[PDB]
């Protein structure tokens, strides 16, 4: 045991010990706290009048928040204060994903339903690239080290670079109705994760494979039997599947009535089902805690979301129980319930009527 009491942890810190995960233990303690406290929602004043919000994403270190709206524009606010600072403007219809660049600075991409990728530069600067059949863009994901961008159009992946005006690679998916919907990467940029439509004769299903991208090898999606991880699942947007900050956990919404499950991504037990729970047919979003010990599930149809704490290691319906109940501080729905990157800063959820709020913990 690498100590468990804060009194003996601060004492060791004062005399320069640095043994074991003292900071990790302190963060786990501060996240175990903020559980018996109360939360208040502070609204955000947006310049124009957006009637809905779809997706949320954060800054590359920790200090900014992006937002999409049906009004065909993207708003960026500030977490510390709560005021918009930029108003992008320029799309023709509603966007679908943002995918803040993780590495360099203030670089934000953007999709649309007409086949446009902008790659904004915040303080001036914007590019453009168009499709060939006016098809929608499901998602994009950057690369941490290399200079590469992936676009989830209809069933191709283009592997574009924002240096020239055209991509340099095309990968097919055999048949035509097996589209691609998620191309999110891993935190260290060593693996890929795709989600394509499972062919059938009912509701559509998806399959999430785990391809390898260590040596910049183009994945072969034409084979539907290699490196399967989850098989059946249900995907709506980029907010329907999340990977923990450490990358050692992955959530899903496999059906059959929908049940929730999280699969470990460690190399020695890659595929184990571990924790599980049964929900109703109204769960839209799922997010994980920064330290990977709390899961929040957004609900839509009052109640806003539910938070659970993973307790039992390897099975049983008793795993994770209700500990939280967030409420709207008053026909309203929720489309995002993402956690803030800081370990124990608060919540942030969108509103079907076009409202962005930030919740923070307060005591009695």
């Amino acid at each position: 045991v690498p100590e468990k009491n804060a009194v003996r942890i601060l004492w060791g810190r004062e005399r320069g010990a640095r043994a074991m995960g003292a900071q990790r233990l302190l963060q786990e303690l501060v996240e175990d706290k903020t559980r018996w406290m109360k939360w208040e929602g502070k609204r955000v004043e947006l310049p124009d009048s957006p009637r809905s919000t779809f997706l949320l994403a954060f800054s590359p270190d920790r200090t900014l928040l992006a937002s999409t709206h049906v009004n065909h524009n993207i708003y960026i606010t500030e977490v510390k204060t709560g005021k918009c600072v930029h108003s992008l403007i320029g799309h023709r219809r509603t966007p679908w994903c943002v995918t803040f660049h993780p590495t360099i600075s203030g670089l934000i991409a953007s999709g649309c339903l007409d086949g446009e990728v902008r790659i904004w530069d915040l303080h001036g600067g914007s590019e453009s690239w168009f499709t060939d059949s006016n098809n929608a863009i499901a998602s994009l994901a950057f690369h941490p080290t290399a200079q590469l961008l992936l676009i989830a159009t209809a069933n191709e992946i283009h592997f574009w670079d924002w240096s020239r005006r055209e991509p340099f690679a095309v990968v097919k998916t055999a048949s035509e109705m097996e589209r691609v919907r998620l191309v999110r990467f891993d935190p260290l940029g060593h693996y890929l994760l795709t989600a394509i439509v499972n062919p059938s004769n009912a509701n559509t299903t998806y399959r999430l494979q785990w391809w390898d991208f260590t040596k910049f090898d183009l994945p072969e999606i034409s084979n539907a039997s290699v490196n399967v991880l989850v098989q059946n699942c249900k995907i709506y947007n980029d907010a329907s599947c999340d990977i923990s900050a450490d990358g050692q956990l992955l959530a899903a919404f496999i059906p059959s009535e929908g049940i929730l499950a999280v699969y470990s991504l460690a190399p020695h037990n890659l595929g184990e089902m571990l924790y599980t729970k049964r929900f109703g047919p109204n769960a839209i979003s799922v997010s994980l805690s920064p330290m990977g010990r709390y899961v929040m599930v957004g609900l839509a149809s009052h109640m806003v979301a539910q938070v659970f704490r993973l307790q039992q290691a390897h099975g049983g319906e008793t795993s994770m129980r209700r500990v939280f109940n967030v409420l709207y501080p008053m026909h309203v729905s929720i489309n995002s319930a993402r956690w803030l990157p800081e370990p124990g800063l608060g919540l942030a959820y969108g509103t079907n009527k076009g409202d962005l709020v930030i919740c923070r913990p307060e005591a009695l």
Binding site: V70, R93, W96, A136, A138, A300, N335, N352
Partner: peptide
């Protein structure tokens, strides 16, 4: 007219 809910927009 694009629907305001995520569960009834086609893509």
């Amino acid at each position: 007219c694009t629907p305001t809910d995520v569960r009834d927009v086609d893509i």
